[PDB]
Amino acid sequence: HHHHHEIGTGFPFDPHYVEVLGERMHYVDVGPRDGTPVLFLHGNPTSSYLWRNIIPHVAPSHRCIAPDLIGMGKSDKPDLDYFFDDHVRYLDAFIEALGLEEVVLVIHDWGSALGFHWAKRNPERVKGIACMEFIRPIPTWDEWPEFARETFQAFRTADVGRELIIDQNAFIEGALPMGVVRPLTEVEMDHYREPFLKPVDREPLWRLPNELPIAGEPANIVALVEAYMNWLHQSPVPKLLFWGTPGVLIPPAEAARLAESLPNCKTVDIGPGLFLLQEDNPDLIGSEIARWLPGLAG
Numbered sequence: 001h002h003h004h005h006e007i008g009t010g011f012p013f014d015p016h017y018v019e020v021l022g023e024r025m026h027y028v029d030v031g032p033r034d035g036t037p038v039l040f041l042h043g044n045p046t047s048s049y050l051w052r053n054i055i056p057h058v059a060p061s062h063r064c065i066a067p068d069l070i071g072m073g074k075s076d077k078p079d080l081d082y083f084f085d086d087h088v089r090y091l092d093a094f095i096e097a098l099g100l101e102e103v104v105l106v107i108h109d110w111g112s113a114l115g116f117h118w119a120k121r122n123p124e125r126v127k128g129i130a131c132m133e134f135i136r137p138i139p140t141w142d143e144w145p146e147f148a149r150e151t152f153q154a155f156r157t158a159d160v161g162r163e164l165i166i167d168q169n170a171f172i173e174g175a176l177p178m179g180v181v182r183p184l185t186e187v188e189m190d191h192y193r194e195p196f197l198k199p200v201d202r203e204p205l206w207r208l209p210n211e212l213p214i215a216g217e218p219a220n221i222v223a224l225v226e227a228y229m230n231w232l233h234q235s236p237v238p239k240l241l242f243w244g245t246p247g248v249l250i251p252p253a254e255a256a257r258l259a260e261s262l263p264n265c266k267t268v269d270i271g272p273g274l275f276l277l278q279e280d281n282p283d284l285i286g287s288e289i290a291r292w293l294p295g296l297a298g
Ligand SMILES: CCOc1c(C)cc(C)cc1CNc1nnn[nH]1
Pocket: 043, 044, 045, 109, 110, 145, 148, 152, 171, 175, 176, 177, 178, 179, 208, 209, 210, 212, 248, 249, 274, 275
């Protein structure tokens, strides 16, 4: 299933920390020290590590900022329920703590829900959005791909799901490498495993799949996601959408629809890809973001 043949495994970024709502959040901060930054938002079950091979394409021209979401990566681990709303609160405060004004967003998965939700609420501060495998409402399980349907239905329970994700670390050991076409190496996996070595620290990994808007639940997330999707369809903000085949959250047919239904939207085919497109073709993702940036300002 996993086909293979140079994707870098190192993380050559100095750590930065900022105090946000009584907690330390870790972030990458490279490139120019001022000017419009490009803000990279990872989703589940990743961290700023997800962007390690994309950032170097952008850092020559723009400040690059990539936070680790609260409870993830190298950020602190407060005793939260880690609902989407918790991530909204911490990211909002992170952005303000850095004094960011106008930004360009580069977003994925739950980072895309964060990014789109933030953009909706702050539309005057978003110069452009690059996105890939983003969250939109999923009307029924019929539309969720069969290869991962029984798995994600099991994840979305309080007994079986917590046993799988918290006790057996199945989201890291199972779902993560399943979301990449090529085989992730032990080194890359160990980077991803690092924040979750202890079962008690896996709460964020269980709550996030339980927050996905599937079959109308949870209703608050469904409504929130519908709201930012409605915003996106009427917004003239420049959009760059990366998609793979067969993809997972954004299949080729959905990408094609969005190419027409989203204003000012350019799409890029990265080739083979499932969920973590950044791990299959970071070169093209990085280079195309870089090609797109000059057209946004100046
Ligand atoms: C087929 C399922 O797609 C996924 C796959 C194949 C792998 C992963 C790591 C994640 C997802 C889904 N994204 C996600 N789950 N909970 N929060 N965000």
